[PDB]
């Protein structure tokens, strides 16, 4: 089933020869997903079963792209205050974020991400909660105010 990349995939720290799989509690008031926990998958950067852990900031964003292996790009839209005119303007910033196999994420879904140790050159958050939500037009042109 799961593995076929050219090294054995193991879920390290599971243990096999004594006991009585493995997953962790994540905290910060979040809930470990049932689909993560009783899922069968193997990972290393998943926040529910890797060695990685969440610490730092917690932000909400909108998913734009789903098309890498287990990795997503989120846009944070926000309003910038311009002191000259006492007024605002839209500006935005992309955060590349690791996913998990647990969620099933579609372009325009809202996601709650957390900060964690660096997992790739620009992958520096990982997804904690998938807030499902249909969208019209294209997400790249869309504006959510969170």
């Amino acid at each position: 089933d799961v593995q076929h990349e050219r090294a054995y995939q193991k879920q390290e720290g599971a243990s096999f020869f004594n006991s009585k799989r493995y997953w962790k509690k994540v905290g910060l008031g979040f809930a470990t997903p049932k689909e993560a926990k009783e899922g069968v998958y193997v990972d290393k950067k998943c926040p529910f079963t890797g060695n990685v852990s969440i610490r730092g900031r917690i932000l909400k964003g909108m998913v734009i792209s789903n098309k890498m292996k287990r990795t997503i790009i989120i846009r944070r839209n926000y309003l910038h205050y311009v002191k000259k005119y006492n007024r605002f303007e839209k500006r935005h910033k992309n955060i590349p974020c690791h996913c998990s196999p647990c969620f099933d994420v579609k372009e325009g879904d809202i996601v709650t991400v957390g900060q964690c140790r660096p997992l790739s050159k620009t992958v520096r958050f990982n997804v904690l909660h998938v807030e499902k939500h249909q969208i019209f037009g294209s997400a790249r042109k869309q504006f959510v105010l969170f």
């Binding site: 905290g27 910060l28 008031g29 610490r55 917690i58």
Partner: protein, 257 residues
């Protein structure tokens, strides 16, 4: 190269050193030691700029060579040694004992203390570590390591500590009825009773503190020093007893003498 910085400009030094603009260019930089740089004083400042037993750094050196200063029951020898948040300075020639305390404006005054109370100090524990063989040890803001601490004492509880043996006499719980002293926040140098505790996940924790004039202010948990239990402060507070007059009243008081 790009090593550690050993110099300290006099202007760049903490405001609560209370040094002037025109007095040379470099301050004493505190040596590394049992209290943080920003949260102490170097012994030179205490001797010369506060007590006034020296007019020069040189006179401080002359005083220091003589083993007539003792901090924490032991002789000290470096000029730049830190005074520490709570400690006992003993000047043996004139038989004087000082305990170091904050005023109500935010700086350290050396406060005249009796011989009997001089033999103990108050130590906040910052951490508690479990070391080999299942033996706990507590770690103090006084830079000092405490072996074989009670399991009944936890991280924000303070502890009364002898200076002869270095062992614990008793402890003061951080319970919401205990006297607390503010150590470094905006409202540094006050005493209150602990009104209320607010615990915030992943982030700073704030405690609401009430003054004896019933004024309330909040402060960050990091800098809060338990100082007694509801009967009394466990060490003798300085003149204004940790109570801060408001500016208008303070100026009105100053004039009305």
């Amino acid at each position: 190269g790009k090593g550690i910085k050993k110099h300290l400009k006099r202007v760049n030094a903490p405001s609560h050193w209370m040094l002037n603009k025109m007095g040379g260019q470099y301050a004493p930089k505190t040596s590394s030691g049992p209290h943080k740089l920003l949260e102490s004083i170097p012994l030179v400042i205490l001797l010369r700029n506060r007590l006034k037993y020296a007019l020069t750094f040189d006179e401080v050196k002359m005083i220091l060579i003589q083993k007539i200063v003792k901090v924490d029951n032991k002789v000290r020898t470096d000029c730049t040694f830190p005074v520490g948040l709570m400690d006992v300075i003993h000047i043996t020639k004139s038989n004087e004992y000082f305990r170091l305390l904050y005023d109500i404006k935010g700086r350290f005054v050396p406060h005249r203390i009796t011989n009997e109370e001089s033999k103990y100090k108050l130590c906040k524990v910052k951490k508690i570590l479990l070391r080999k063989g299942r033996l706990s040890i507590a770690v103090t803001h006084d830079g000092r390591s405490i072996p074989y601490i009670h399991p009944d004492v936890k991280v924000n509880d303070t502890v009364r500590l002898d200076l002869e043996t270095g062992k614990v006499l008793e402890h003061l719980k951080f319970q919401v009825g205990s006297l607390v002293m503010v150590t470094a926040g905006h409202s540094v140098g006050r005493v209150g009773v602990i009104s209320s505790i607010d615990k915030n996940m992943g982030t700073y924790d704030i405690i609401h503190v009430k003054d004896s004039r019933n004024k309330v202010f909040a402060t960050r948990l990091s800098n809060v020093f338990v100082i007694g239990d509801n009967t009394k402060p466990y060490i003798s507070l300085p003149r204004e007893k940790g109570i801060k007059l408001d500016i208008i009243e303070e100026r009105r008081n100053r004039l009305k003498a």
